[PDB]
Structure formats: structure tokens, C-alpha cells
From a paper:
Phosphorylase kinase (PhK) phosphorylates GP and transforms it from the inactive b form to the active a form to initiate this important biochemical process. The 1.3-megadalton PhK α4β4γ4δ4 hexadecamer consists of a tetramer of tetramer, wherein four αβγδ modules are connected by the central β4 scaffold. The γ-subunit bears the catalytic activity and consists of an N-terminal kinase domain (KD) and a C-terminal regulatory domain (CRD).
We also analyzed the cryo-EM structure of active PhK in the presence of Ca2+ and determined the structure at a resolution of 2.9 Å. When compared to the inactive state structure, the most notable difference is that the KD–αJ region of the γ-subunit and calmodulin were no longer visible. Within the structure, ADP is nestled between the D1β, D2β, and D4β domains. Notably, D2β interacts with D2α to establish the α1/β2 and α2/β1 dimers; whereas D2α interacts with the KD N-lobe and contributes to the maintenance of the inactive state of the γ-subunit. The ADP-induced conformational changes in the β-subunits would propagate to the α-subunits through the D2β–D2α interaction, facilitating the disruption of the α-subunit–KD interaction and thereby allosterically enhancing PhK activity. The allosteric ADP site has now been elucidated, revealing that ADP is surrounded by several positively charged residues in the β-subunit, independently of divalent metal ions.
Residue numbers in the entry:
A (entry chain A): 3 to 154, 158 to 212, 231 to 359, 363 to 622, 758 to 771, 778 to 794, 796 to 967, 1051 to 1221
B (entry chain C): 329 to 359, 366 to 382
Amino acid sequence: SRSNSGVRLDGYARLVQQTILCHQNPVTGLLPASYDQKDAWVRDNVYSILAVWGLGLAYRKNADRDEDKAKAYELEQSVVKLMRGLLHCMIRQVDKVESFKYSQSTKDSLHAKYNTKTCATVVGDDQWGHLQLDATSVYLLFLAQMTASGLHSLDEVNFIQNLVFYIEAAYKTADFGIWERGDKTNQGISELNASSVGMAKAALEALLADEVQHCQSILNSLLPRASTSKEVDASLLSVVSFPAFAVEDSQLVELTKQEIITKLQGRYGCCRFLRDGYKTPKEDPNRLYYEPAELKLFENIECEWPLFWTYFILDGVFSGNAEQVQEYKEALEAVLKNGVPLLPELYSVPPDRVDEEYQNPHTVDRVPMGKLPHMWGQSLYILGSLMAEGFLAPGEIDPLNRRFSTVPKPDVVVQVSILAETEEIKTILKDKGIYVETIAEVYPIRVQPARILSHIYSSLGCNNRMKLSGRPYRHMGVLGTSKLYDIRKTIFTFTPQFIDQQQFYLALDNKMIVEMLRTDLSYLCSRWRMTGQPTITFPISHSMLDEDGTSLNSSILAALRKMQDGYFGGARVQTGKLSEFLTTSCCTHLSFMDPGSGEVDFKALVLQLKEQADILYMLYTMKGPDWTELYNERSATVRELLTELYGKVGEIRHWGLIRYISGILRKKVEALDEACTDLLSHQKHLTVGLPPEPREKTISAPLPYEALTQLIDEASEGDMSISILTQEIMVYLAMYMRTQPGLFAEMFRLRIGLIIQVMATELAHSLRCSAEEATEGLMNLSPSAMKNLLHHILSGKEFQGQWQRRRRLDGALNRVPVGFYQKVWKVLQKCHGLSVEGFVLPSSTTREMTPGEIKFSVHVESVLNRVPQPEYRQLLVEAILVLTMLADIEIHSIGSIIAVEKIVHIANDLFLQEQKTLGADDTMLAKDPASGICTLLYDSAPSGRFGTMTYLSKAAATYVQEFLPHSICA
Amino acid sequence: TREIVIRDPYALRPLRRLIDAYAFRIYGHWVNRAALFENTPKAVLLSL
Ligand SMILES: C/C=C(\C)CC/C=C(\C)CCC=C(C)C
């Protein structure tokens, strides 16, 4: 090997020694960022040791002589030393890991910088924005990979598992990002970056799959966009490619790479993100933050980082390629010291040449500044060279086969065991043909609720010596409660979450349980990427039987018979005894569980209750609010009979009553924070009340269950029977996004109050009735019937007045056209802003929002979609797009903030005159008591000579006539 | 020219094609595709 491969290996040894290993501290093993930046970043240290690890691996695959063994051992032990030093850096902050485990706050996060001479902390928590889930996640990922490569106390194992819990909730934790500045605006605003989420997913996979697939949901929803305030980040290459490989969608990976190439790639590398301005000649060097008005200034002149082209060589090596264009384009290396490449950190447009670069993008000869060499980039450069020259293989750097993520994974067959709670239930199930086994017969396998599984993991990770307290109580979804568990040598199987949660009306409806089971199976068939085959334990309880008790629910039978047939829930299902499923299951072993009016005196007014059960309940709110857990003077309290009333109406299944009792007793869904976190996990915002704006409190970020529940209560303003609707509809939307997320495309802000109003309207026109009696029959809907209404609301299925209904359906669902937000970005260039109901969407937003941001989307949907009425909004949507339509033909720009409502109205006044003349009944046109827009205008089709969009075209042209006196149109 | 958009946006062809395309982008999820088209004033419509 020394003939022609040992000399080149020694050349790379000199490269790594003179670029990386020269700066490693003999005391700590950490690497200072540069001469000026003497501190050691976690992520930079982890990335900078990749070259050393790869060299050691190279040296070892050819280590036969001693000297070669000495070099390989030195390199491998340098890598081990660096990782151990970073460990004591994190170990010294065990009080921060423990605090972030429960309260994921930026003030309780691990520091990014550490003293390279003492493994201590250099700055204060307040001083750097230390929350960077990607640094800890990349450390965990490469700790898993290096160990799987043969690189070697239990206390640090407990600390590492507590770090697993630390980065476990990264799909819902705002971050300061890989660039440790949060959002682009650069005001220290913690933001959810897909880079951190993907790195956390990779670290967890290499090292509980529920939060792993939550991170997967974040990745699918966010890509190709980076985060809320970023169209694209070149750091996404660290997720869709080396080192995370956290995206298993090949199309998504290709789309993200193409977005990076098209938007950020330049002559001297790739810009980190659009309007970055980290080392641009336009920033203020001594000012830490960025004013929202200078972000425009950074456009088209952002610094291009050669570091990202090392990622483009790494993929290309990991995935075989002729991307030998990414190499050969890195001739932009500083010294050819002696001849050391010295990959720069970034290239900045020379200051004088700002105007030329702005105008002519990616064309000016930039200068190198920042760190030189960028050790994070230099290590990746050396690793890619090693890998590309045949001295290394993807399987040596990646012994965990993270690269095989993109390969299509086959559908999984979910084995289900239907277990009888009681033997009588088993007898009924058999009369009907499903042969099952009782929970007693399944012994020695012990069936437990998922609550017990969540509590068991709270004893994982605990060392009281360093004050680490297990894992926080997290709800285990279907993914967690589908593996079999080896606890104290006896196998424990756990039923899904939705079965033991019988505290809200959803569990009483057997159809709901069928629907929850179907959603769980659909989620399992797609998200199970685990060794073994998942096993859903489905016990048929006594509540699952019919009214008589000698027969089983039809819906539950039908579901079980379909599962026996192999298909239910979009999933192939194998039913059988739980004993048969031991050999082909994810039988994980939990080793931590081994031991070792008048008359205001309310003296006698409840006497009227002593049989309609509606009236009995009605009195009971007078006697609750006026008199909830107070006495009744008959060995009874207000709460007690309300619970008795709740049980009675559950037995009679008159759903309006159950909902009301639930509503005034403040029944709350336990897995509701999970529903909100799932809906927000898919990059969909939520608003909770009736539509006028203050009541409708928006949910932009995840909220803890107490807050979420409290936000729901205050959004009803005391008006009952909607606070429960918000939770129930949120749950249904979560299930439908888990199962049929295509239904939720072109939707970005779910207005629950508008949804409820549109369900009431649909119950009013279907089963024609008054809108009000329909608002009351919506109460009397079964939970599964209401879920069906929501399906039909979403998919627009029907059980001269049509176009008003559509305009309503789409507006309530807040459905926007494809490309609508980017089109709004275009008009804001022309006009000075849009005004809806007096609220202004200024053009200054575009000076800090790139068109494809999901932060500009929110800005638009907060000025436009806030309109209470469902249709008025869909018309305001048209008037914007006809404004977008006519902006292209118009050659000039106007200095007015255009009031879209007026264009809607001017079209309204243009609707009376034209229709009256074409000759239509004056009473045929009817104004709206809420919007002042003729009902027939809503009923009008979009296109045509009398189409509503044509009227707005005749309105916008007659609107901008006084603003634009002259209009040399194209 | 503006006057044409004000008077008869539809006849002028280039604009109509745009109007009809915008109708679909927004509302082709509801799709003869004619439902998205209204060439009768509701009176000649509600005549039968
Ligand atoms: C050529 C004139 C029209 C086609 C009338 C409709 C256009 C406008 C009223 C102005 C559009 C320009 C913006 C910046 C919104």
C-alpha cells in the first residue's frame, strides 16, 4: 500500500495535521475556531474531526506495520479525545440538559462555545444564543457512527440518553439555528430550522421513533424551505445528504438540492441563505442585530461559502456521481502555507462592486474573508477528497447505513391482535367469526395501557448522582405502542393512546375508535421504519358492545373483519394470536426496568329536577354558574349530577347533551396538545375562535396543553359549545393530516371557528333547514358523523345557489391558490401595499421577506384571511389575484396602498348596475347583512362576462384610475 | 388599455384568457369545466 497509496495517505496526513490537528488542545482535545475565535464550537468541533476520523479509518484499513498502526491509533484517539472533551463540555452542563429536558427554553440550552483550554463555558447564557439542536444532534450522530466503527462509563451513557431526550423534542422546539442567529431578521428570535430537526432525526435514528417521525413530518412539510423565515438554507445539504440523510424522499432531496443550486450557488460557493449579510459590505460590523429595512440591502450580494460545496462533493460520493464539477470548481482555495489549500469561510463582494453584483447576480470577483481555513469546511474538503480518491468508502464513515435512507421502503404489514377483554366478549366475537384470545389468555404477555409505557420511560435515564431525572412524560403514539417490550423478562404489549383515553366523548362513539384505529394503521404503514413488524394490540372492551350486550358494535365488527381480510386503514394487516407475533416483532428490551329572577335565595330550586334529561341538564347550568361543585342538599353536589347527567346522556347517546355537559363541566381532550403539535408540525398555523380577529387567537407555535386549553376557553368568550368544538375539530384535523395530508394542501391557517360555521351552513343546506336549527343539530351529531362532515368539508363532496356555497367552503377552510403568496409578493413591488378591512400589508415586508417564505405567507394571511366572513375573504382573494393579473399589463406603479375591499365593493356597485340592466329583479339582488355584498354576486361564477372576477377587473381598473391618472398599459 | 379593462374586460382576448386561467387556478379543484364560467346575467339564467 506504500507504493502509490501510502504516500498520498501521508500527504493527506500532513493536510489534516497542518489544518486541523495542529490546533487541537492537548488538555481538552477541542479545536478553536480560528486565531481570533479561540472558543470551541460544538458543531465546528464535531465537523472538524471528520477528516481525522476518516484518516484514521484509512490508515487502519491498511495498518499492518507498527508505524501505520501508530498513526491510525493516534488519529482515532484524537477523534475520541475531541468527542470526550465535548462530552465534559456538555457534562459540566448537566443542570442545563435536565432543565431543557422538561422546559425547552433558550435560557436552559447547552452552550455552543466552550473554553478550549478547560472545557468550561466562555460566555453567559444570555450572550450567544446557545440553543442549537443541530450541534448536539451532530455530536450524537457522529458519536453513534464512530462507535459503530469501533471507537470506544455508564454515567455518561445515562447522560447521552438524557441528551437523546434533550434533542428528542426538536420538531416542536424553536432554535437559534446552525448559524446561531435564529431567524434571518437577526433579532435573537428562536426559530424552527429544518437543519436542526433533520440532524436530530438522524441522531435519534443512529442512536423512541414517535418524535423521530414527528421530525420527519417537519422535514416533509418544510422542505424545500428551510424554516419560517428562510426560503432555502444551504445547510439543508447537511439533512438531505451527508451527514444526516434524514430525508427518505428522493424527490424531496433532489428538489432541495436544486433549490440550493438555483438560489444560493454562486461563483465562490453557495450563500447560506437569501439576504444573509453575515460579512457583506452593507452591514454594520459593530451592530449585533439587523434592522428589518436593511435585509433588502443584503440581496444579491450575500457572501458565498465554499463550505457548502464540500457537501456537494460528499453527496456525489455517497451517491455515485460525475459531480466532479463541485470538485474542480474549488480551485478557489487560498494557498494553491506551503501549498495547503486552506478552504476559506466565505467570499464577500468587494465593497465597491456592490451595485454591479446586485444588478448582475453571481458575477463579481469576490474576496476571501472570515475564517481561513474554515476547519468545519476544511475537514469536509479533506474527507471528500479522501472519499473521492478511493482511500475511503461511504460504508466506513457511515457504518449505520444512514445513506440508505432514500431507498424506497416497502409497505409494512401491521400485525394486529384483537384481544378480548372478557371471555363473554370473546364468545360474542366468535359467534360473529373473529377468533380471538382474552387478555387473561395472552399471559405471560401482559397488556397494559400506553400511560404505563409513558411512565416507564420516565425511569430511563436517571442518575441521581448528577441530578438527571429520567424522561419527561411524553404521549406514546401508535409507533411507540406498536413494538413489544421485554420488561423484567416478561413481554409487555401496550394498547394505543386512543383506547385508554376515555375521558372525552370521542371514546363513547365506537365509530370514532374505528376511525382512530384506521388513522393509526395508516400512520403505521407509512412511518414504520423499524426492525420488526409493528403490533397493535386492540382489546374489545364492554363499551365496544351494542346496547343489548349480546352483540358487538357493527362498526367495530366491520373494522375487525376488514383487518382479518388483510386490509384496513390503507395498511395490510395480519391478524393472529399475540403469541405468534413474538418472533417477527420489534421486541425491544427495557433494561432500565430491571431491579437493582326573583327569590335569589337558592334554597329550594333544584326540586323541579325530581325526566326529559335535557331540561334536567338545562337547569343545571343555572345551578352551576349561579350556584359547579357545590351542594344540592340531597347528599348531592352540582358536579355530581352533572357527571350523572353526562353518564345518562352517554348511555342514551343523544350527543347534543353530552357535548353540553362536557362543555359546562370543562371536559378537555388529553391528547389535544398532541393534535395541535401535529397540525403545527405540518407547517399549518391554527386560529381558535369565532372569526372576528381578537377572539380568534392564532396559534403560530406549539403550545403546552394548559395554555392551549386556556386559549380555547378564552376564545369562546364564555359562549359554550364551541370550546369543545375547537378541541374536537382540532383532533379531527390532526387525524386527517396524519392520514390524508393531500386534503390539507393549499391550506396554511386553519380557522376552527370558520370551519365550525361552514359545517353549520352545510348542515343547513344539506338536510335543508334553518341555519340555526342546523347549528343545534351540529351539536347532536355523533363524533364520527361530525368527522365525516369535516371530511366532506375538506374534500368538497356533496351528499343555482352553488357558487355561494363554494365560496364559503374554500374561505372557511382558508384555501389559497397555488402560487398565491408569491403573486402577492409581486404586486407589493408595484404598489405601496394592500389594505384589507383597514389593515395594511406594507411593501416594506418584501424588503425583509423573500417571496417564498412561510413568514411572508403568515404576514399575508394575517392581513387578508382574518376577514370574518368566509366568502368575502374568497373574494378578497380574487381581487388580490386580479390585482396580480393586471399588474403585469400595467407598466407603471402607484403610490397608494391599495384597498382590496374597495375593489370588491366597486365591483359590487358595478354588479347592481349591470345586472339591473341586463334586467333582473331588484329584489333578486340581495345585500349581505354582514358584508354589504349582493348575494347574487357570491352566487356568480368567477369567469365570464358577468363573472365576479371580471367585475373586479372592471373594479380595479376603475379603482386605480384616480391613483394612476395615466396608465400606459401593455 | 385601462378603458378596455374597465368597459369589457372579457372581450378583449388576451385579458380573457387570463381571467379564465385565474378562475381555474383558484377554482379548478372544483372541476365541462363550465361551472367556473358565467356568460348569462342571472336574469336570463333565472328565467327558467
Ligand atoms: C392597465 C390598467 C388596468 C389593467 C386596470 C387594472 C390595474 C390597476 C388598477 C393597477 C394595477 C397595478 C398595481 C401595482 C396593482
